[model samples]
Target chain A: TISKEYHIDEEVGFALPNPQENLPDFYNDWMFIAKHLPDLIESGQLRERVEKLNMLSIDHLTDHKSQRLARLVLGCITMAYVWGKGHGDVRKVLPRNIAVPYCQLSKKLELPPILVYADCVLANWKKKDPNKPLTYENMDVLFSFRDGDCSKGFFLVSLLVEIAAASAIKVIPTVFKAMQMQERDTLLKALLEIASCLEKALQVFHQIHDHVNPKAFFSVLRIYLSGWKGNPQLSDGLVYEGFWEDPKEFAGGSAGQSSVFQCFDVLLGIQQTAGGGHAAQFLQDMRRYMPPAHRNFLCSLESNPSVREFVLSKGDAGLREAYDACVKALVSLRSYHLQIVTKYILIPASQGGTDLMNFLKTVRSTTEKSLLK
Target chain B: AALEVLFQGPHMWTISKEYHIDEEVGFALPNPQENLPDFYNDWMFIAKHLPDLIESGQLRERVEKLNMLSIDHLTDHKSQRLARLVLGCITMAYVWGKGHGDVRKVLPRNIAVPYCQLSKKLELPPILVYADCVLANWKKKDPNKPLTYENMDVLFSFRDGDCSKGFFLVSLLVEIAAASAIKVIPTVFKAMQMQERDTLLKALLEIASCLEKALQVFHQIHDHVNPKAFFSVLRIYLSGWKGNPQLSDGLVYEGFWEDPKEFAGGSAGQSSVFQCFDVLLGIQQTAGGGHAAQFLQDMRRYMPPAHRNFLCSLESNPSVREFVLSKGDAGLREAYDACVKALVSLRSYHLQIVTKYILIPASQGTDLMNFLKTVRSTTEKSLLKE
Candidate 1:
């Protein structure tokens, strides 16, 4: 009932109302690849296509559009590396076609090699050695982008990559441990640090807000931001409710599968049973967007729940305090989102957005009351 | 000379858990009595009449007599009370008189001279005790290695070792004292020359950096100590109490400390000394309050009146704020950002403890989390409404 009104057109995919209306060529290439790349990845042509695209350097492209296409290709190639070649420490040898060239592109783009390798390609690969712990020191390399005269186009892509890196390298491991209640104190502290890291990363948007063409960003990149919402078609147009599958069930997925926010609910042990109301249902719908394996991993914790049972019994106060603090820190991210949406979407609509604003308020009232305070 | 006597022996300044076992740290914890009248009147006299006494040169004679009387009847109840008041006033005179780079000399050398003798006689420095111990920790650490986060963590992590709980208390007291010093920096700048201001600002910047490092150490040591005892001492320092036996011994002491407990409870816009510093630096424009704005308003009563008046006077000074603004927006913004960062870090640190020690242990289940969420939501909603 909640999401039905919002689901307008699944076939529309990444298509915008006015594709050429103030949309740069760079953004257009991004939109085209985003809309079409999933099918190629599914058809087994993804590796060949990415390998063919690897021959051209980002600098070789004169126009901004070509450069953006280069970025889109690099991102898709990196994604194929994770989803295709490597899925859970199988140790399949990566072909140099995608590997060596991605590094070449990373250098031209000023992205760190670890980000390309660790965060992008091998994001899901857990350590073979328990003693070699990952630290924020490694994550810091992702955000260490060269701040000189990079074009706004390159910077936006760089920013998105960092955001993706943070979600993967920084947030995931801690939350995975937190779900199991292992090192609860240390894990909670790491979560706090992660929150700080995310906040600092997102603040870059504020700084570059003027340079960014909102139409391009919201239209092209927004689709890529979706994560683990179950099927939107079956639900009431709501993005949160959807289907959960076994790890091998789905071969096709979108960039949204890598969203970090979905883990917030997983770690908190929130699941939407029938009549669970808006927040629960809202959280349920989000699962559809997650990569099936990631979604399954989140759900698997339910069988041997640590935090949920701990909170239910002895660790309630500590978990409550940690959960509350974690939620409050996340609220700042939401606030930033609201600010961006207002600036890019609502204000651009000007006198016409009252209904949209009202609907937002309604959605917030329903979900927040049930899920939050 | 008096400071030498107070600072001389290793035993005098040892950092240990047992340091607070024998001596009283602050006013009796549960319910402290109101400030005594004689003690209150003496401070009032110092505030009102010090300048006049200094001009007449009668301050020295009177101070000497007061010190002599305190020593003579040191065992007497009222005299013990008198002794502490003298100590507190002399210390206050020393720090505050020279506060604005000695801009307003409330005490001349004539009075400042004999006060030292009285301090030596009492075997107490006319300065904050916690500060002395903090200084010693830095001095005693490996001379080749400088103070960094790791070393400082070791310095205060004595609780896990055989050291007394008093070391943590002492470390906390240093934060409170440092906060007080930072609060006074803008005033110091206002009285300084443009050339003098850079040196002062550099020193203050260093102190602020140190405070942040100290806060990180504070984050680490939270699990090693008892929350109830730690928070009890923190509350006394931040809120300013009237009867700490360590500082005043016999005198009734009152704190001008800004309460940060409201922030701990997740309330925004509650006043803190850091907030005061922000306003002084022109980072904030208002000393915002709840309810009516009239003088002696009931809301202001939460703060003791004398300290309240002092705060009100300081807030009205525009010199430092004007100076910072004159430099440009970037300077003010830098100041603002540093303060907000510290405030958020501290709040997050407290939230961790609130979870680890208070909430998690209580096991209130879903309802507690829900209650906190509701409280948080209300605050956010209120922020939006404004």
Candidate 2:
């Protein structure tokens, strides 16, 4: 109950609580790490401090505030340790101090051990003034991996991207209800809600480059976001202490793991599974990286009939265009994410950039193909 | 705007700000005004000097001679709320501030006309209410602090002392504590429709936890208020025009009503916070169905109109109790029953406090005690059986 509000916050577009800062006194161990996470990463002290540190028992974390803070703290420490200098200096083994509690807390929070999309972006932010609305400019990440506009901006942009989708996320149950009633007009109105929110999502998507310096992002922050499996640097997979006797491999944080976009795909019947192979399999595996409750919310939407099938059963000119219009909005949003991928990773010609670029291109094409004739 | 009105009810309730119920405060004014349009400054002056005037026996004289200010100058919701709260507390102070030494039969037309007009506009009764006395009556003591007890004060007061501050401040905390539960109301409804049992049980447990916290806060009234002082001094002022032997026929609001009017006094029963829980859980609150049931119905008129409307809308929507009863899952049943038992515990505690504050102090008989236990067991009866 302490964190159920955090679990089901629709007002902030299913992100973490708006003012996600300020854990209780019992959680000061985790809070202390988060307070100095930016400096620890930038000054090359993150790993050194994590090594010297005692294995802090997380048994004292009694509330959602402490638990959520623990995830953010552990994620920053784990990511900073792996790519403390750059992708060139990747660490193959996680120390017991970092990896032991990291896996334990991840198991409790219901995500994978490494920094995933849920921790790095969804739960990483705080509103500067809660009185002011959470716009991209007004929001700030509570902890950071690097000391640039690129690292924090990369996070805030994604947070805003998720926040924009709240406008659509709320309409999902409405679309389900509309499908149940077979009300063509109600379906169109619900689609308009989705269409505009996805368009707003596309706006926030392109806003990333203004803060994230394309070249510097590849140098400093890009490697920090890298994971063990499917990563160019740590392809043999990295070792997690205590939990696995041998190396424990996992996928990196990707928007592919974003439950918001998956809702868009499943609700609209955007099929990416048949011909896409690993790109499809990669996303299904990303399910292991999302919070179980939120992951289950997507499955609930999947259980109901998709708006595409319901519309195909009762085709009308106005209805066809509105459904197509929402599909187009999702396509444009996917295309813009592809555009940012090109700018942030591909334009710099970083190692392993082409694989991700081709994957995103496949995602955008699949979204566009969902359009009706 | 059409969608705004469409989704304002429980079935599709969005946190639309246009609806009078606040997500943070729950019928509490988000930003209450201390100063209304200056035209009503004289009424403000009367209300501010109430304690001094009452002790000097000048309060009745002061209200009688005051100019009848028109409420037309009060343009917005905040201004009207401030005026209504000021007028409500003023009437309370006038009637009961000095005790039964001087019982007035007719309220002065100066404050009476505008009080009715504001009540008519607000769709509340022409009496002091929890909406005015507790919800609309506070402001932050510091300009830039959170709205907690330490940082808040009674924005308007009958007396510039801890007594009014204590009673009102604690009530605000109770309201704020239930706010988390209020947000979960829609979540439970949505879960019932989606047949998401995990989400349903989680939301039910959260509501139970939130109400349990509210009951804990309600217990702290003793730390702030002495039971003796509240009974002897503050209780009468909280008492309304109706349901009293002394004011049994009610007070005539001279200009508005030629005959005496019997409106229930500003009662805690008028609180929308508790009513929301009752409506959501589908507790048939009228335990003994005669005077007790009618009394519950009467006090609801004392609530803010839009909030009252929200309660009615929830009643007509699908019932949470019905949903829980239909689901045979043990986890969901315990979660739902836990929330009901929390309410029962809160009401039982409420009976204990009433004994200390009203029953033993006033030395009341069997009827009031019967009503108290009756309402509580009705909450208990809401629990599901095998």
Candidate 3:
């Protein structure tokens, strides 16, 4: 059975070797190989894989077999991880073009496209294809990818999140570039579809409150809004707030001050006078016309609900499968660099961590070693 | 300009139905023939481009290095993901200029994107800043008033709306164009760092994609989405189209041009471009094979089903209310007055589709262009006899 060896048992959960020596050499080697630098190893693990797999991907892509393409994407992504861990050259692991293609193809297939190339380990297949029915055998690759045998700790979640985010970034532009050249109606239609899906994903993530670990929760606010602090342009009213016109000012901008409710509208409409074009104004106007409830909720602090409803809805089929695949890889690929927050990172200073001095020493030593690598 | 073209004056609400309107607005769709790749290209493209190197070890190393930093050294007091997600989504929306802002009256002496500093740093042009200052002073109730997001572009458009000579106007227009690109959507993480850049870009692209889809679905599923909810809102934004034959013809060519500079210069030309776009969208009935027609029908049905009942309920006053609601009578006018003309032209044939199918007739211009032009002129004329 595919998951038999790797399954996290219902009762005991699972445990690691507790020490480096007790772990499988492959697992141990994976940690060390992935963590080490170039020129220091026999051969970069990625260099070997990329040299073969990249060509195979090119060859496989041309074959026009959706099944084959799907399989290759899984295989190549697997190779990417193995190479990254062993070679330390992450480039060979998750190339943008390949990642985007995989995402685009899956999207075309109406299979939930993996948001993160790294997250692809979560997907499963052939469950319902009765003729060549598979349970765990076909899922071995998925099992290996998910087990977190290679990666561990909180690092697992963090890496997966980061990678998924990265893949999303790379894949969308390609879709947009295609959209831009089309008829205005087509482009707008396509753009809106993609935007809605992404929002759905965001909403779903927001609902899974358990997923809001300290690192992720804090990361969301601190990085964007804080840096945007002084931006009057970004204040609740100017951007997200529904009040387009201050009571004192009358309407004038062509992009329509009133409609700047959704993220789509703000970017397309008001950003226009800032950019000043018909296209931009068109976008603003479109946002203005959207149903008030949906727009208001999305723009409001309650945007979390919008994200949850839209995103989780996808989980019934494609998205859930994608999430499963990613979770497995997330755990494994994440382990090596993942260090526990212990008391320090989790709680406040005095009670939260080990003594500040000792913590500082550990942090300093860790930083020194990592930077050197 | 955001308000004049987008908000409440006359045509501001027209935006939500853009997929329908783009037929009139003129931005072309992708040429499907162009992007489809041969098998070899798809495969080779993937192979040559996989981010395997980054995935292998480089990414982990970078994170490990950054992760090990001391609490104080983590750069920010909070380095959490929720904040990251929120900030990432917000900043992206902001960068795209979609959400709202909460600007206060005070904060200027302390901080704010001041007109002069913005002009210099963001390439927002001197005259635009000067005009903003003038408006800020003129509308002094909240020097922050012009500073508001919704009105600032209009202020700038007013400056760019000047009747200046050729190159000055060109330069002014160029600067205005650059403003959106420069409207920095501040990020919590630096893009210079590849990993964070990767994350941020992903969040941005995904969010943008989602919003794009939401807007489309709003139109495509017309029965659920509602067009009156759309048109009632967008009809308020007609003025944003600038050269829209309906708005400007009544003001400019109809000879009551009060502000020569207002509807006379670049804004007028820009408005004309909108007219051309409408004409193009109105004419391209056959574009995108048949997808265009299908898209229109979807958007039309999304209008409240009651719209059909409401129209039928006023069976006696139907023609007048229908004419006014559609402005379909304008279709008989000259091409220069095409926006009005096209509306009237559409109603003539829409009546047939409605009669035949016994459905709520969506007087879509694309359907009209394809159907009417393809029909005999006498046949078209007879259909309009209603």
Instruction: Report, to 2 decimal places, the DockQ of model 3.
Output: 0.01
Per-prediction DockQ:
0.01, 0.01, 0.01
Query: Which CAPRI level is candidate 3?
Result: incorrect
The interface RMSD value for candidate 1 stands at 32.0
Local accuracy of candidate 3 as per-residue lDDT tens digits, A112-208: 2222211222221222333442222221222222222322222233322322222222222332333334333443343344344433333222222
Displacement of the residue A354 alpha carbon in candidate 1, Å: 7.2
10 residues in a row with least lDDT, candidate 1 chain B = B259-268
Encode model 1's per-residue lDDT on B1-386: one tens digit a residue.
Answer: 11121112111111122211112211111111213345334433543354455445454445434422223334433333333433444434433332222322133333333333433333333332222223212221343554333333222211123222334343433344335344334334443434455554554455456447546656545545555543333222221112322222221112211221110110112223333444344432221111112111222222222222223333433335355435554644354345445544554564565566446545533443443343333323322112
Candidate 2 Cα errors over 4 Å, as ranges: A1-373, B1-10, B13-15, B159-162, B363-366
Name the regions of candidate 3 deviating beyond 4 angstroms.
A1-54, A57-373, B1-386
Q: Between 1 and 2, whose TM-score is larger?
A: 2
Model 3's number of clashes is 164
TM-score of chain B of 3: 0.18
